[PDB]
Amino acid sequence: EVQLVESGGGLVQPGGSLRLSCAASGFYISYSSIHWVRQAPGKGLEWVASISPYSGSTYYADSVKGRFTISADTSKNTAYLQMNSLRAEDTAVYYCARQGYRRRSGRGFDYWGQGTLVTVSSASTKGPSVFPLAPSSKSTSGGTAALGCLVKDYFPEPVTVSWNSGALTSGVHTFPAVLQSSGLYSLSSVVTVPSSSLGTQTYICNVNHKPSNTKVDKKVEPKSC
Amino acid sequence: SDIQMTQSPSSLSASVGDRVTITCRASQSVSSAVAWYQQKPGKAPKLLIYSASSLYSGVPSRFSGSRSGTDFTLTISSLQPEDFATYYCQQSYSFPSTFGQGTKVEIKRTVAAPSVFIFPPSDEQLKSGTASVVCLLNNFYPREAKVQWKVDNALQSGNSQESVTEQDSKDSTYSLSSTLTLSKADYEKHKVYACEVTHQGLSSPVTKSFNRGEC
RNA sequence: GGCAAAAAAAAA
RNA sequence: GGGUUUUUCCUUCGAAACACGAAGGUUUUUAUCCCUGCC
């Protein structure tokens, strides 16, 4: 029932400024310590700030003091993180964590937000062009065969793909975006089913790129005759 | 006077039912103010052990932690497939707080051969003057497996990108995407597009393909 | 033996 | 030696790493305080 929901990250240019927030539900933020923990792409976690209860005292990693500043609003049951003078090194996913109850878990962090990704870059955003990958056959199609959407040329991460608006989960594989020399991302999402049910069912993928503010649904079919 | 956490190792791989042990050593005293987390790819971390050794309410019993002075271990009595994750140790003894570089536990399972696929570049993408033939390896093990592209039997190099999923949480299989990127010229220029993969479920290397036009 | 006194500030 | 009067460190707890609070602890420094009268 307890839940933290961070938001407010995205693409920002070097020297720029952001504000993240952390919306608490399930418990009142005034009676625990709230911390922000960031995680670079593919690297490890790093503590950033925390504010402790009653005193409202804050503390910051050496990486970000002077630039970062953590506040809490007990009425909106929200904790915030104003970020100034942003640098490429600051590109990461940002988590807010609650410090558990002293008896229940000491200084352990017992609930975490799902994290909000901050991209520090000079580049400007592009949404993807999405192309279907069709199951290719020159004879009869009575087996299990695969199909998928190619999602090419976009920036920044992330995109979210969903087959038939969430109806299809078994055997779905959304590959991690790889970054082309172009400087844009591109990935492939594949799903497997027995072709016995190919002709009766429909295969649309729900692609969504909120940075670029793009939502596209392509409709995967077979090829020539 | 910042405390630094030194986790060991960076990666490791054990079979199901194996016993596995991670350790973190502290630069200086942290009392028993140490916590351990599990992080599955992409999702947020999860508390496994608080107070260096106490087990968090709800975690399985197979995870335990102990402290020997400044030497902290995290032990998983029986490995299970659900347990492929990345583990971090955290000191909360003083500020600033410090984690380890992280241990990435992989899982050992029987060899599983990939089922291979090739896709012609959709012509909507040929509507845009570029080519993306793409090759696929679904549900296989181990991770290390090699794709070669041929174009009219001409071996290709330096033009293809591979991407691989994380290990599966149920059967601990992998999956790979080799995407060859080319022009609209080079696609209707040559005729056959071969993709050969050499892996250990294969006595001999398997190759799948098609021709251009005849799709 | 039985009473009564008196009286400033620092550190773990 | 025994004290008075002020400080701190530590411990358990308060929704509690600091700050605030409650209940507790056993040490030691300052020749930089008192160890004086009465049947």
Side-chain angles (χ1 to χ4, degrees):
Chain A
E1 183 166 316
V2 163
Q3 186 169 12
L4 293 166
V5 193
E6 50 273 318
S7 56
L11 177 63
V12 79
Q13 283 173 359
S17 315
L18 250 53
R19 161 158 117 169
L20 305 193
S21 59
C22 181
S25 63
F27 74 98
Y28 292 94
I29 60 170
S30 93
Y31 314 119
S32 311
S33 306
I34 298 302
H35 314 246
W36 283 97
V37 181
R38 73 154 163 235
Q39 180 171 39
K43 312 316 231 287
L45 320 173
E46 182 182 2
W47 176 85
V48 193
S50 97
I51 175 180
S52 35
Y54 301 88
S55 72
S57 308
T58 51
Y59 324 86
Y60 309 86
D62 287 88
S63 285
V64 306
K65 196 34 204 154
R67 315 186 299 126
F68 285 17
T69 167
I70 176 176
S71 76
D73 191 342
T74 47
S75 58
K76 315 191 182 45
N77 214 55
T78 297
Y80 302 96
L81 183 58
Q82 183 88 244
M83 302 168 57
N84 296 337
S85 307
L86 284 169
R87 300 174 66 165
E89 293 85 18
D90 289 310
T91 297
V93 171
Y94 284 71
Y95 298 95
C96 50
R98 173 191 87 167
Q99 174 157 330
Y101 294 114
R102 205 184 52 98
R103 308 300 290 286
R104 185 139 210 189
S105 62
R107 315 265 183 90
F109 297 176
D110 56 5
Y111 296 91
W112 299 54
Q114 80 279 351
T116 174
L117 199 158
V118 152
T119 304
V120 174
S121 175
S122 315
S124 47
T125 86
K126 194 220 164 192
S129 41
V130 47
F131 305 120
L133 303 185
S136 180
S137 198
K138 256 60 66 192
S139 194
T140 67
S141 185
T144 74
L147 57 96
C149 295
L150 196 68
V151 172
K152 193 149 166 324
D153 302 308
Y154 71 88
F155 185 78
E157 273 263 67
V159 302
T160 84
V161 317
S162 324
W163 284 95
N164 295 347
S165 176
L168 182 70
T169 63
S170 295
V172 67
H173 285 303
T174 305
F175 290 77
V178 61
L179 190 36
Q180 324 170 247
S181 153
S182 321
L184 298 303
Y185 291 92
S186 91
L187 56 83
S188 325
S189 181
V190 178
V191 62
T192 177
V193 278
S195 84
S196 179
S197 296
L198 187 146
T200 170
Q201 202 40 239
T202 70
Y203 298 117
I204 72 168
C205 65
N206 297 31
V207 183
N208 189 351
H209 187 213
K210 192 205 147 43
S212 148
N213 215 266
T214 288
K215 179 165 197 258
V216 174
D217 316 312
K218 212 48 197 185
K219 314 156 189 212
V220 194
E221 304 299 327
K223 283 319 297 315
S224 206
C225 195
Chain B
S1 266
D2 279 11
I3 305 179
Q4 95 164 25
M5 302 300 287
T6 321
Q7 211 164 334
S8 321
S10 62
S11 160
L12 69 93
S13 302
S15 318
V16 286
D18 269 14
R19 183 184 219 108
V20 47
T21 305
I22 293 161
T23 63
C24 264
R25 182 180 175 273
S27 151
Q28 41 152 293
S29 186
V30 285
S31 148
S32 293
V34 169
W36 295 89
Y37 304 96
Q38 176 195 56
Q39 187 190 40
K40 294 261 215 318
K43 194 42 201 133
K46 293 146 119 56
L47 188 56
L48 309 174
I49 300 285
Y50 69 90
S51 288
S53 49
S54 305
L55 183 89
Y56 179 67
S57 53
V59 172
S61 83
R62 55 161 175 273
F63 302 84
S64 60
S66 56
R67 163 204 180 181
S68 167
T70 41
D71 284 32
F72 296 79
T73 87
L74 162 79
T75 80
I76 309 167
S77 49
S78 158
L79 209 48
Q80 285 231 266
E82 38 194 302
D83 291 324
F84 147 71
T86 308
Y87 296 83
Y88 288 89
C89 72
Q90 187 221 1
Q91 71 84 358
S92 290
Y93 179 64
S94 76
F95 293 120
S97 204
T98 315
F99 299 87
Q101 288 40 63
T103 307
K104 181 160 235 186
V105 180
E106 308 154 275
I107 299 205
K108 281 189 179 127
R109 82 141 268 170
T110 84
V111 171
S115 56
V116 195
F117 300 77
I118 182 170
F119 294 80
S122 83
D123 308 67
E124 294 102 319
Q125 188 210 181
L126 283 96
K127 191 88 185 87
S128 320
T130 322
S132 68
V133 53
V134 47
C135 206
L136 193 178
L137 302 76
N138 202 25
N139 284 345
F140 71 96
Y141 188 90
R143 194 209 275 114
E144 306 86 20
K146 307 299 148 202
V147 152
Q148 198 53 238
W149 283 107
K150 312 266 187 188
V151 192
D152 279 353
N153 208 145
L155 181 132
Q156 279 291 359
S157 291
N159 34 66
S160 79
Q161 291 180 305
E162 283 83 15
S163 156
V164 46
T165 85
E166 306 279 21
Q167 186 160 52
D168 195 279
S169 156
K170 310 184 214 71
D171 46 12
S172 286
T173 62
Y174 294 101
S175 312
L176 185 154
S177 269
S178 183
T179 321
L180 189 52
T181 166
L182 287 145
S183 71
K184 190 199 302 321
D186 294 290
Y187 177 69
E188 223 205 334
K189 267 197 71 282
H190 304 181
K191 281 53 181 161
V192 305
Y193 286 98
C195 164
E196 95 173 48
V197 47
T198 175
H199 186 249
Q200 327 326 110
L202 294 319
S203 56
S204 61
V206 48
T207 307
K208 311 301 297 306
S209 189
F210 66 112
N211 294 346
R212 200 233 322 130
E214 173 64 81
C215 323

